[PDB]
Design a protein around this ligand. Structure first.
Ligand SMILES: CC(=O)N[C@@H]1[C@@H](O)[C@H](O[C@@H]2O[C@H](CO)[C@H](O)[C@H](O)[C@H]2O)[C@@H](CO)O[C@@H]1O
Ligand SMILES: CC(=O)N[C@@H]1[C@@H](O)[C@H](O[C@@H]2O[C@H](CO)[C@H](O)[C@H](O)[C@H]2O)[C@@H](CO)O[C@@H]1O
Ligand SMILES: [Mg+2]
Ligand SMILES: [Mg+2]
Lengths: 133, 132
C-alpha cells in the first residue's frame, strides 16, 4: 500500500515538491492528493505501460467509489530508475503540475477544498522527498 | 494527531533532512524514527518549555512499553516561529543529528536495524520538508 503521508497540510498558495525514482521495472505510479483513500482531489498517474496506455500521464479525481473524467497528457519525461522532481501548485480552481522538463499539466480542483491532509504514493516508485512551502 | 509518514525508507548511508517551523508558542516538538508506534529507535524532542525542561533537546528510544535512558543536550539552536533544517545520518553504531547551527548530537542506535520505515512528528511544529 505504498508511501502514506497524513496531516502534512498542503494549502492553496504553497508548492509541493516531490522527489522520486520510478522502480527499474515500473509499469506506472500515482500521486494521490485529497482528504482520504475514498476522497482524492488529484490522482496523477504516469504510465510507462499500464491500463492500455504507453508513456501517458493520466489525471483524474476519485470520490464515493467512482473515477471521474480522465485528463491525458502525452508529455512523459519519466524514465525507469531515473530520479525526477515534480512541483504541484494549486488554487480553488486547479492544480498546476510542473514536470521535470519544465512542462506543465493543468487539472481542475473539482473537490474545491483549499487544504488537503492526505497524500498517498502508489505503484512502482520510491519517494525520496516531500517538501511543502 | 501530528504528521505520520509510512514506508518512506531511511537506511545507513542516507541523509534524512527535516525542514519545519515550530509554532509561535511551541512548548516542544518530536521527530520519531522507528518500525512502529510501539518501537521507536530515535525520539528527538526539542523542548522550549515542557516537562520542567527549558531550551533542552531530549533524545531517547521506546521499546517493550517503556522509555529507555534519556540523552539530554543544553545546545538549543531552535527559535519559535523560525524555520529549521535538521540532518540525520545513521550507522549501526549511532544516529548523528546535525542541528540548524552546524552543531551535532550523537545518540546510540540501540535497535540496530539498518533500515527504518515509520516516521511520526509530534507537537507544536509545521513539518515543511522530509527528504532521504
Ligand atoms: C483510455 C482508458 O480508458 N483507460 C481507462 C483506464 O485509464 C481506467 O483505469 C483506471 O484509471 C483510474 C484513473 O482514471 C486509475 O488510474 C485506476 O488505477 C485505473 O485502473 C480504466 C478503469 O477505470 O478504464 C479505462 O479503460
Ligand atoms: C529529567 C527527566 O528524566 N525527565 C523525564 C521526562 O523527560 C520524561 O518525559 C518523557 O520523555 C520521553 C523521552 O524520554 C518523551 O518525550 C515523552 O513525551 C515524555 O513524557 C518522563 C517520563 O518518561 O520522565 C522524567 O520526568
Ligand atoms: Mg526544570
Ligand atoms: Mg562504541
Amino acid at each position: 500500500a505504498g508511501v502514506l503521508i497524513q496531516n502534512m497540510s498542503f494549502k492553496v498558495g504553497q508548492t509541493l515538491t516531490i522527489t522520486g525514482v520510478p522502480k527499474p521495472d515500473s509499469t506506472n505510479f500515482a500521486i494521490n492528493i485529497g482528504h482520504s483513500p475514498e476522497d482524492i482531489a488529484l490522482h496523477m498517474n504516469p504510465r510507462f505501460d499500464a491500463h492500455g496506455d504507453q508513456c501517458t500521464i493520466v489525471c483524474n479525481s476519485f470520490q464515493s467509489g467512482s473515477w471521474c473524467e480522465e485528463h491525458r497528457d502525452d508529455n512523459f519525461p519519466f524514465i525507469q530508475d531515473k530520479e525526477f522532481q515534480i512541483k504541484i501548485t494549486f488554487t480553488n480552481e486547479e492544480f498546476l503540475v510542473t514536470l521535470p522538463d519544465g512542462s506543465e499539466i493543468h487539472f481542475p480542483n473539482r473537490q474545491g477544498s483549499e487544504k488537503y491532509k492526505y497524500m498517498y504514493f502508489e505503484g512502482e516508485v520510491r519517494i525520496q522527498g516531500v517538501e511543502i512551502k
